[PDB]
Symmetry: C2
Subunit: 485 residues, 2 copies
Amino acid sequence: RPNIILFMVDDMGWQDTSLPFWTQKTHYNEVYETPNMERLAKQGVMFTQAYASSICSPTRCSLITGTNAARHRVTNWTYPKGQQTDRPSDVFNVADWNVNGVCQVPNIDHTFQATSLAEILKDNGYHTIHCGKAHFGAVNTPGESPYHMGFEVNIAGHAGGGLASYLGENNYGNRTDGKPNPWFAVPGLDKYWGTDTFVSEALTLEAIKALNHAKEYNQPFFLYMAHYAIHVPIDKDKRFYQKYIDKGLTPKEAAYAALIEGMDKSLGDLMDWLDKNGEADNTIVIFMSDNGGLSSEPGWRDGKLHTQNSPLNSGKGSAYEGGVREPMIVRWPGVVKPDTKCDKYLIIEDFYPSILEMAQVKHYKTVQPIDGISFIPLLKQTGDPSKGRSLYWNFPNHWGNDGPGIGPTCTVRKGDWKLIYYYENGKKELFNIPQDIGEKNNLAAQHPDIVKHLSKDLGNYLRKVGGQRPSFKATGKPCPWPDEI
Amino acid sequence: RPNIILFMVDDMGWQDTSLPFWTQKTHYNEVYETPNMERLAKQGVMFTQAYASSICSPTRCSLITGTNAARHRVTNWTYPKGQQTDRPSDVFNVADWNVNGVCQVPNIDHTFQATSLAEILKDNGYHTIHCGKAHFGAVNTPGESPYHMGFEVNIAGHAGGGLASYLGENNYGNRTDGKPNPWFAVPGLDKYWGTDTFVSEALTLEAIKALNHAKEYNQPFFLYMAHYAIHVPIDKDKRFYQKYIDKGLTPKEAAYAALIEGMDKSLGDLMDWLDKNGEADNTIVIFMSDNGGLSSEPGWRDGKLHTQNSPLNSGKGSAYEGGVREPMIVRWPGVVKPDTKCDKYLIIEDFYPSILEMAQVKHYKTVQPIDGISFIPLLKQTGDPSKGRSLYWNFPNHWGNDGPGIGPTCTVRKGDWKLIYYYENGKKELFNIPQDIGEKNNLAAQHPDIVKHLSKDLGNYLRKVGGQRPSFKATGKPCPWPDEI
Ligand SMILES: [Ca+2]
Ligand SMILES: [Ca+2]
């Protein structure tokens, strides 16, 4: 039974790497430096059409419970207990969504009760390690604890979905007065306060400590290496920052490239550990990101706004490909043909049944229905779970910044066609993704047959799984479903 | 569904309290001060005939696994991975016992695999908290972790069964200059280092914050408050030490009395926390100790050696009552009638079914058989699990000291009669416990009928549960079972 490592970067877009996931190298592929992603890819398969939701919380709750985001209703980011983080709107009320996230127990207000992926792995004999960003439940809610969620070891994981600082010189946001700590102060790295250890480095050091400890136990391990990295604020990692200045990047872009290269140093350190300790041929490594790169905030990024995941449109918080299409690599020695690419689409809730299959766990009990479809047939080249398959997103919410494809929406992807419905004004956009990867050309008027059919598909699904919608403040009435206009 | 607090003291004797568990007050009762134990007893039931094993490891593993010590084979104290702590003998070899303790996973070298009591509570909706001495698995084996054993919260719990120092001035044993930490350094209390916080105080304050956090979750809790007190070394607690010196006690005994009182202050502090947060009426409090007081060592205790649990014979490590009869109290408002006593005997593995029944876990499955018998019928005066019941101990090991009843033995108690068999020379002792509480009068010669039947009772049970035995170095052959002599 293999060890499993799920290496999850935060807010990393499809092109925030030197490894080309498109059909040619982009301007971004040329300036970033991720040699360890390339090396991992030479040894495995990369998925060029892998999907998440557009925001941390819906993606990570889908990962750990195996439900679609429309069903678990954690559709915008969580932290404050019993409170909606949504930006105000003069037009609509957001859905009455599950602001407190997921947990494994019943009767926790505004949560989705679910059998945790880590719990099933643990109860089947895996040693389970969480390291970095957890972000599964609101603060003072059982899901705030990686331990409650079935992890036996927890490094730095709590309810926070961001981080107050990468810099050890700032204690990662922790106060040494009687000052109250920020929400996103990173716990569990006290050993490193006041030093110049970047938080990404510290997480990898502690992760390697946990991995050496796991080698004392005669059981396989599951490691969730969930970086805070490349979430805002984009602090400068001085280990690589100047090199990108010398390369001619703006300070903003140099800072961002340097978070990327530091993330990739963490992957290499783990890969080197696997090599030095004889675990590499018996260990599955999965690389993933949880939503698109941030392309709506010019105070962090340069370039034309909403183009920082080029050639994809927009980014984090958007229904467009820039916000949902993610870099994904799997290495499974003996099973997965090295140096290959797979173009069949999949979505984050598939990780749940797939990882359990990799762990050799069958007919397990869950309190919630599982919406993920295993993508082992893509890993083994034996089947195509994307054929005839519909993928669903639902964001009856209001995130923080305006832009293309951002706002309260629900999306269905089926075959070549993507339907994006806009709850606020009833607008519909139809894109043929293989022909129009940048979502430049709205085909809705040229194909009302596809629009009607896809709208029914989307509408039936949302209602079937209990998905929610916003309502209009002027009238009190719910926004029509896609198939009601 | 009530909250449950299991308050477990280490190495506390039947008479290490001001609350008299005998039918007459002793001199120890006069000198010690446990006013909060008296308070708890006036509101609950005292068990005047409650048994553990004579050593920390078999007792604690029986509690957590519901298994009699003979079956789980963690029959002497554990810490070093894969090594016997047993004293060397030029007479016998000890059993090939489970030096590595218990865990919940299989294929772990010298462990008893078992479904943990905290896992079943956790999986049935309880918020599970461990605070203090865990001592469930050897260092660098899975059961060293309270988290592995099903606790969602761990304060100071590791593989250590002892502690380097009670003094925050001594960092509870943790080194700061250079990297060599002693086995029993107390983890998880770094913010108390270099203060004058006695460790029992530190444990209480962190338990109180774990309970405040537990108020945030809409689920009942289980707190395993397992003190390191009153284990050696007997450090002086300045809060109480001089008072006992003024009462007239020798320094050794004043330090012991001070350990006893600081334990009792912790009990009071949790009891007041319950009172002040509205939890006292829906919380079960179980007071228990894991074995008899240390009466082997004149460098720690004054008075006639091997009498420090008087009127009981001997103490820790002995199969005599001084090694196994423990102080036990249960408060359960609305169920248990206050200020009462229960004479019926019970044994530590019974805590496992009883706590699950208190938690209304009406159905569950376990990988291991459950030897404990619920004592809820004693709490409610509905029945008598004690009638006809045999109790069993097996110590096929070599503890560090000699003394009365200490050495490789197995024991059966049944009705009024207790039979101790000595592996080293086949000696048998038969005592009428209700007539001879001090075990001063061996009645084997007077009742050969009994000795044989109880011999067969013991032998059958040991073989039935797969218990173990020493072997002789002369012949190489196992020591005779009691019913082969
Ligand atoms: Ca994210
Ligand atoms: Ca003990």
